[PDB]
Ligand binder design. Structure first.
Ligand SMILES: [Mg+2]
Ligand SMILES: [Mg+2]
Ligand SMILES: [Mg+2]
Ligand SMILES: [Mg+2]
Ligand SMILES: [Mg+2]
Ligand SMILES: [Mg+2]
Ligand SMILES: [Mg+2]
Ligand SMILES: [Mg+2]
Ligand SMILES: [Mg+2]
Ligand SMILES: [Mg+2]
Ligand SMILES: [Mg+2]
Ligand SMILES: [Mg+2]
Ligand SMILES: [Mg+2]
Ligand SMILES: [Mg+2]
Ligand SMILES: [Mg+2]
Ligand SMILES: [Mg+2]
Ligand SMILES: [Mg+2]
Ligand SMILES: [Mg+2]
Ligand SMILES: [Mg+2]
Ligand SMILES: [Mg+2]
Ligand SMILES: [Mg+2]
Ligand SMILES: [Mg+2]
Ligand SMILES: [Mg+2]
Ligand SMILES: [Mg+2]
Ligand SMILES: [Mg+2]
Ligand SMILES: [Mg+2]
Ligand SMILES: [Mg+2]
Ligand SMILES: [Mg+2]
Ligand SMILES: [Mg+2]
Ligand SMILES: [Mg+2]
Ligand SMILES: [Mg+2]
Ligand SMILES: [Mg+2]
Ligand SMILES: [Mg+2]
Ligand SMILES: [Mg+2]
Ligand SMILES: [Mg+2]
Ligand SMILES: [Mg+2]
Ligand SMILES: [Mg+2]
Ligand SMILES: [Zn+2]
Lengths: 43, 119, 101, 89
RNA sequence: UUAUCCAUUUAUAGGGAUGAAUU
RNA sequence: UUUGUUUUGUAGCAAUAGUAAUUCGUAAUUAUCCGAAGUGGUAAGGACUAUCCUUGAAAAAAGGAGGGAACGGCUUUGUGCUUUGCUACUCUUAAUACUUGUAUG
RNA sequence: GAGAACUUUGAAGACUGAAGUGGAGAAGGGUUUCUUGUCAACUGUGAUUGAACAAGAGUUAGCCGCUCCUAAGGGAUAGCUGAAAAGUGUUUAAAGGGGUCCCCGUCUCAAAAGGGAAACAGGUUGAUAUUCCUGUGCCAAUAGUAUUAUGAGUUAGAUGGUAACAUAUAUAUAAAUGAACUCCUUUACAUAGGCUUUACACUCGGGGUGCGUUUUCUUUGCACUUUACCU
RNA sequence: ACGGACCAAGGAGUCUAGCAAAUGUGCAAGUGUAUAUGAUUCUUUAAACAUUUUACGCAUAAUUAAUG
RNA sequence: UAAAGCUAAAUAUAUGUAGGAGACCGAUAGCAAACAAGUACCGUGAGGGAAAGAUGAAAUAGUACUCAGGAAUGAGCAAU
RNA sequence: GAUGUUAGGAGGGCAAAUCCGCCGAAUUUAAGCAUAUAAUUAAGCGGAAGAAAAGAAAAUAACUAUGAUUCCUUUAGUAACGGCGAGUGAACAAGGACCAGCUCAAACGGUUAAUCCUUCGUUUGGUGCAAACCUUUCGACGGAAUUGUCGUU
């Protein structure tokens, strides 16, 4: 809820970071995307 | 863009001073990056590398001095001790392994495994 | 009382524990932060997740001619800390902002 | 009864029985029991079973960078004495 | 009775003739 | 020190804040903010009364009491203790200055 | 806007009807929040919308909680069991604290609804507010030595009051000797019934402001008239 | 009566142990060189070759609970 | 010659790493996994557990330009 | 005997294919099933190593005798066991691979523990650029040891 453990918060942050799409420039030298409503983190 | 061989000669205090300066520079770069800028965003990496090098040099120096301090004297700090696989450490020294009982030694001395060319 | 003939471990290496450089990571811009700087003489800094309020204050003191009245901090969901630093009335955050770059 | 065994009942499903688990990081730390279903956290052991071969394989030594073990590998081959650099120049 | 077993407590004076209570 | 009368104050917070206005300007002024009472819907408290073969947690923490251990300071002499001479002393808040790790969250 | 029944704005007409699709929270969720974009797919019709996609941005506390205490309980210490793994928790223990040697004494976890140091009001953001700002407070700390002031007591420890009991109002009621060792009390408690007191809420009558109705009628209908902790 | 909407790919008497008869082949009162050794054997060589300058199997004899 | 002990060799290895192989398999095969595979995802949990290779010699030839389109796309007398 | 954050040390966990203990089934086969069989197997738990374990005869034989273990070829699908059913099932010899033996206890030595260890050292060497190792003999101050170390077989 609105009162999380610090560790949990960190995990959430990490997940969020993971979520973001490939920086496009790489493509010139993702399958693991997630949606908060369809696949749960099961934390 | 200072390299290792130039830093080995410098006194520790001087090295420290250099390092602090480098750190300061890095901080500035970071600040710039944070602000809407992309001018010196690629310079930072080099600076970081330099800093790392400096740190390494200083660390090595520190280690050397420590080693000098703790020369012989039976026991030594576990870091300065010859770090090797635990099992190996546990294991008896080759000499120890060899060490036979007195009678056995005598026997060995008396009748060694001689070479006896057979024709 | 301990009386060790030789100390177990001697980390002769330069301290790993975060100094001022690394404690305080960078000033934050952002419209919010700019507003803060303008209206309430508060400087916003991204800082190490493991920096304490005292520590941050110390860093601030060291990194700039600034004195801090109060420091509020929060953990961002990017795994960084945001420190809201209110400066004492003697200082003008704007001028100090300018100085910082 | 609206809280029947199917859908009605699934609505009352709130509150973790297992959390993340320090040591394994696998959400199998039974909170109430204070024991990990996968590692047996508090028990000074890893809790692995020869009847769970797949499980064993998914958690063995080779899974996860081997921070130190990897570094050590090849040392034997080298057989370099400990604390020695190569000759300068 | 000493092995053993059970109980009791802070293991607290060897057996008989509707206040306070301590250095 | 007590009695009589008057003027104040939304008891301080408090009007500088709100709200409803009215303007003037490209934010400021002004005027308002208070006299009577009923309903008993909530909530809390109080004193009670009744029910029980049901009598309805514990500790951290705090307070009070009994009890009467110990007993001013300084100077000198002998081996913390004893003897001799002198009178501002024992408290207590707040402030301050100084060392000791940087003595407010 | 290429394109609109389902994007936005106005005007109607309607519903939800304080047991609300309204405010706050908990569990669970985890960036869904917000701004600027924006439409490949998804948004079972469309869609320019979106809880979608993209880029950023956003969560500030001594006082609100957790953090401390114990509860049902749990994990362990000593043992003792058991091949061990585990099962038990004083059953035959040399089991840290308080005072000036004695006197106590399993440890630790377990409540974000039990117990508990202390915070309120206005303002502010695109998104945070008892957390930021302005203002006013409160609580806990605060080493030693030395100065200071503040008042007590003495010339080793006040007084009043018949009594119930009261008294230090110094910026601030700070100060009313007290050790060991005890004894209490607070913490600290069920349910039902009514009765009372306060509070908010609602209402009524009047005055004061603005708005509404006016073919006719109405000294009229509605709105605002506010006041926090703390002392 | 059951199975089959359709199509593409996958999809089922195999492999080893010992025995058997069949037949092929070599040798034949013998046969099989087992392990293992040896080599002027070493990409193939984990095969091929060689068998110490009375091993054992099965067979050559059967029969009996059995000393035999 | 029990009720004390030690001791290399031959021998075993479906684990790990590193080599070398095949009358082996050839992307529904071969490890579950030729690919960001024990990955995504599912399960409270013990666990379960995929799909998914190929342009060309060369993208240092990955579609220029013109026209119609809101745009996608389409078409070209154009183009690799 | 407690006690020590005393000085110096060790154990714990991970990893298992081979390996060594324990502990321990059932499906299954017997055309049922109960002994048997699966199987001294799987799982469980504990422990090692590059191998482990075994090993230097309280061995086999009945010979003209062999001579630690292990492993292979063999004995041998044999002796034997087995509702004598299903099934199970060695060993000696023989041919090899490899071959390695030993020391404690006890006997003896008291004209004397001849032993051992901690700490502090002392000075010749050999390598290496260093880091480090590698050896060499020599005494102190402690202890341990007479409830027995060391030499002798
Ligand atoms: Mg939650
Ligand atoms: Mg859902
Ligand atoms: Mg905070
Ligand atoms: Mg059910
Ligand atoms: Mg539960
Ligand atoms: Mg006003
Ligand atoms: Mg719709
Ligand atoms: Mg209605
Ligand atoms: Mg209705
Ligand atoms: Mg709503
Ligand atoms: Mg939104
Ligand atoms: Mg649609
Ligand atoms: Mg939007
Ligand atoms: Mg998104
Ligand atoms: Mg609180
Ligand atoms: Mg406690
Ligand atoms: Mg309890
Ligand atoms: Mg237990
Ligand atoms: Mg607790
Ligand atoms: Mg509470
Ligand atoms: Mg049929
Ligand atoms: Mg059909
Ligand atoms: Mg079919
Ligand atoms: Mg086919
Ligand atoms: Mg034939
Ligand atoms: Mg042995
Ligand atoms: Mg495949
Ligand atoms: Mg272990
Ligand atoms: Mg058994
Ligand atoms: Mg059967
Ligand atoms: Mg059958
Ligand atoms: Mg097993
Ligand atoms: Mg091992
Ligand atoms: Mg061995
Ligand atoms: Mg054999
Ligand atoms: Mg035979
Ligand atoms: Mg058997
Ligand atoms: Zn775990």
């Amino acid at each position: 809820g609105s009162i999380k453990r610090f560790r949990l918060k960190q995990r959430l942050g990490k997940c969020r970071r993971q979520n973001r799409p490939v920086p496009h420039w790489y493509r010139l030298k993702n399958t693991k995307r997630r949606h908060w409503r369809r696949t749960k983190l099961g934390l | 863009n200072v390299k290792a061989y130039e830093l080995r000669t410098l006194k520790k205090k001087e090295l420290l001073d250099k390092l602090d300066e480098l750190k300061k520079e890095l901080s500035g770069l970071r600040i710039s990056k944070a602000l809407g800028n992309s001018a010196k965003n690629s310079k930072i990496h080099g600076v970081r590398k330099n800093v790392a090098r400096v740190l390494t040099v200083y660390n090595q120096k520190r280690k050397m001095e420590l080693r000098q301090l703790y020369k012989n004297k039976k026991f030594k700090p576990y870091n300065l001790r010859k770090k090797l696989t635990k099992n190996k450490r546990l294991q008896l020294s080759p000499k120890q392994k060899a060490a036979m009982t007195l009678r056995q030694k005598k026997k060995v001395q008396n009748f060694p495994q001689r070479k006896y060319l057979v024709v | 009382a301990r009386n060790p003939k030789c100390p177990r471990i001697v980390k002769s290496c330069h301290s790993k524990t975060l100094d001022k450089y690394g404690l305080i990571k960078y000033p934050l811009t952002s419209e919010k932060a700019m507003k803060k700087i303008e209206e309430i003489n508060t400087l916003v800094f991204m800082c190490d997740k493991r920096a304490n309020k005292k520590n941050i204050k110390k860093s601030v003191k060291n990194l700039f001619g600034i004195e801090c009245d109060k420091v509020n901090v929060l953990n961002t969901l990017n795994g960084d800390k945001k420190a809201y630093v209110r400066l004492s009335g003697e200082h003008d955050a704007l001028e100090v902002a300018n100085k910082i770059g | 009864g609206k809280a029947g065994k199917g859908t009605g009942s699934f609505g009352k499903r709130n509150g973790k029985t297992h959390f993340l688990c320090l040591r394994c990081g696998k959400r199998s730390y039974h909170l109430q029991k204070k024991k990990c279903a996968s590692c047996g956290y508090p028990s000074a052991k890893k809790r692995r079973f020869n009847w769970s071969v797949k499980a064993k394989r998914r958690n063995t030594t080779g899974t996860g960078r081997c921070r130190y073990i990897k570094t050590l590998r090849r040392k034997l081959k080298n057989k370099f004495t400990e604390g020695s650099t190569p000759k300068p120049k």
